[PDB]
Scaffold this motif. Structure first.
Motif, short mmCIF file in Angstrom:
data_model
loop_
_atom_site.label_atom_id
_atom_site.label_comp_id
_atom_site.label_asym_id
_atom_site.label_seq_id
_atom_site.Cartn_x
_atom_site.Cartn_y
_atom_site.Cartn_z
N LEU A 1 0.77 -1.33 -0.31
CA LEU A 1 -0.30 -0.14 0.33
C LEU A 1 0.47 1.26 -0.38
O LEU A 1 1.69 0.94 0.85
N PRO B 1 11.58 5.62 1.34
CA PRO B 1 10.42 5.12 0.40
C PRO B 1 9.84 3.76 0.95
O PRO B 1 8.50 3.89 0.11
N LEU C 1 9.29 0.33 2.62
CA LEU C 1 8.83 0.00 4.67
C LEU C 1 8.22 -1.25 5.09
O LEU C 1 6.93 -2.09 3.95
N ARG D 1 3.51 -10.02 12.36
CA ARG D 1 2.17 -10.08 11.20
C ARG D 1 2.55 -7.96 11.88
O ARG D 1 2.21 -7.46 13.26
N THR E 1 0.27 -5.04 11.60
CA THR E 1 -1.41 -4.46 11.86
C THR E 1 -1.21 -3.11 11.98
O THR E 1 -2.20 -2.28 11.50
N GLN F 1 5.89 3.33 0.87
CA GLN F 1 5.51 2.33 0.63
C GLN F 1 5.15 1.00 1.47
O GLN F 1 6.28 0.92 2.13
N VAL F 2 3.93 0.89 1.86
CA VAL F 2 4.15 -0.54 3.23
C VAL F 2 4.00 -1.97 2.04
O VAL F 2 2.88 -2.23 2.22
N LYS F 3 4.63 -2.12 2.44
CA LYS F 3 5.04 -3.51 1.19
C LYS F 3 3.85 -4.82 2.03
O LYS F 3 3.38 -5.50 0.98
N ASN F 4 3.67 -4.96 2.80
CA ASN F 4 2.59 -5.45 3.47
C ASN F 4 1.69 -5.36 3.69
O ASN F 4 0.83 -6.55 3.91
N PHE F 5 0.83 -4.29 2.91
CA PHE F 5 -0.11 -4.16 3.45
C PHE F 5 -1.13 -4.00 1.50
O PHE F 5 -1.15 -2.89 1.10
N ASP F 6 -1.33 -5.54 1.82
CA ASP F 6 -2.15 -5.68 0.83
C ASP F 6 -3.90 -5.28 0.98
O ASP F 6 -4.62 -6.91 1.67
N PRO G 1 -4.21 -0.23 -4.09
CA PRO G 1 -2.45 0.20 -3.93
C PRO G 1 -2.33 1.47 -3.56
O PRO G 1 -0.95 1.74 -3.19
N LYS H 1 -3.96 1.02 9.80
CA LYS H 1 -3.85 -0.07 10.22
C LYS H 1 -4.46 -1.07 9.42
O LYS H 1 -5.25 -0.50 8.19
N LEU H 2 -4.26 -2.58 9.30
CA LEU H 2 -4.70 -3.50 7.72
C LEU H 2 -4.75 -4.32 8.80
O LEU H 2 -4.27 -4.97 9.33
N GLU H 3 -6.48 -5.15 8.64
CA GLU H 3 -6.70 -5.48 9.65
C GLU H 3 -6.88 -7.06 8.82
O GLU H 3 -8.01 -7.19 7.79
#
Ligand SMILES: OC[C@H]1O[C@@H](O[C@H]2[C@H](O)[C@@H](O)[C@H](O)O[C@@H]2CO)[C@H](O)[C@@H](O)[C@H]1O
Ligand SMILES: OC[C@H]1O[C@@H](O[C@H]2[C@H](O)[C@@H](O)[C@H](O)O[C@@H]2CO)[C@H](O)[C@@H](O)[C@H]1O
Lengths: 135, 135
Positions: free
Chosen positions: A3, A119, A121, A128, A130, B4-9, B119, B133-135
Motif C-alpha cells: 500500500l 520510501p 517499509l 504480522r 498491523t 510503500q508499506v509492503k505488507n499491506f495488501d 494500491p 492499520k490493516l487487519e
C-alpha cells in the motif's frame, strides 16, 4: 502488492512506529526500511530461536539484498516475546537511526548511506504488521 | 513521497483503518483510495463549512482526477468535529465499499470499477493522517 500511503514522508525528524503481533513459536522477524527489499538502510532482526542466536537483536544494512549484508551490530538486551503485540519507533538524522522499542531498549545504528528520506517499509519473518503510524 | 508499506495488501475482505486529527477551523477533508490520485475508487469527503455544504459527507469516484467526478452520494449523518481525532475503517467486496466511521454511521458506496485490490491511499484537505492499520 503493498500500500502506497501518500501522506507518510518518513524524512529526518519524523517518528515512524510499526506495530503488530509476533507469531507463536517464532524463529525471528525483521523490520526493514530503505529504498526496496534489496536496498535497506536498516534491517532490525529480533532472533528468538535461531540456532546459535537465541534472543539476539541483529542490526545491519545491505545495498545488494541477501548478498550484501554488511557489519552486524548485535544486542542481547532482548525484551519481546513470542505471540505478543509489539511496537517499535524509528527516527533518524543524517548520522544515526534511533530505535525505540516499546517497553524495551533504545538502540542506535549508523545511517550508513546518508539517507534523508526512506520510501520503503517491510516486516519479514515470523510476525504480522498491523499498524504504521507517523508523527 | 509517501511510504510503500509492503505488507499491506488491501484486498477484498481486509479492513483498512485510517486515523488522524482534523484541523481546527476546517473546510473539508477526504480519504481517497484507488490506484492513484487521479484514479480513485472512493473519495470520502467530510465537508464541515464548505459554502452550501455544511456538515455533509460526499462520496464519489473518478477515473480522470478532478475532471472525472461522477455521481455523488451524500449523507448528512455527520458525526466528526473540528480538531478531533477520527478513525474510519474501510472494507469492500466486488460490489460495495463498506465505510465504518468510529462512533458514527456505517455507509455503503458502489465498487464502480470492480476492484479487488487497491494500491493507493491518500488523505487530502484539512486533516492530518497519523495512523494506518490493516487487519
Ligand atoms: O545481518 C543480517 C542478516 O544476517 C544473515 O545471517 C548472517 C548471520 O547473522 C551471521 O552470523 C553470519 O556470519 O552470516 C549470515 C549471513 O550473512 C541472515 O541470513 C539475513 O536474513 C539477515 O538477517
Ligand atoms: O464529488 C466529489 C468532488 O466534488 C467537487 O465538488 C462538486 C460539488 O460537490 C458538486 O455539488 C458540484 O455540482 O460539482 C462540484 C465539482 O465537481 C469537489 O470540487 C472535489 O474536490 C470533490 O470533492
Amino acid at each position: 502488492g503493498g500500500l502506497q500511503v501518500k501522506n507518510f514522508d518518513f524524512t529526518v525528524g519524523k517518528f515512524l512506529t510499526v506495530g503488530g503481533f509476533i507469531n507463536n513459536s517464532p524463529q525471528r522477524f525483521s523490520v526493514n526500511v530503505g529504498e526496496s527489499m534489496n536496498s535497506l538502510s536498516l534491517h532490525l532482526d529480533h532472533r528468538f530461536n535461531y540456532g546459535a542466536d537465541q534472543n539476539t537483536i541483529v542490526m545491519n544494512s545491505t545495498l545488494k539484498g541477501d548478498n550484501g549484508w554488511e557489519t552486524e551490530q548485535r544486542s542481547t538486551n532482548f525484551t519481546l516475546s513470542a505471540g505478543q503485540y509489539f511496537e517499535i519507533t524509528l527516527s533518524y538524522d543524517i548520522n544515526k537511526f534511533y530505535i525505540d522499542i516499546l517497553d524495551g531498549p533504545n538502540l542506535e545504528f549508523p545511517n550508513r548511506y546518508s539517507k534523508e528520506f526512506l520510501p520503503f517499509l517491510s516486516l519479514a519473518g515470523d510476525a504480522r504488521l498491523t499498524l504504521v503510524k507517523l508523527e
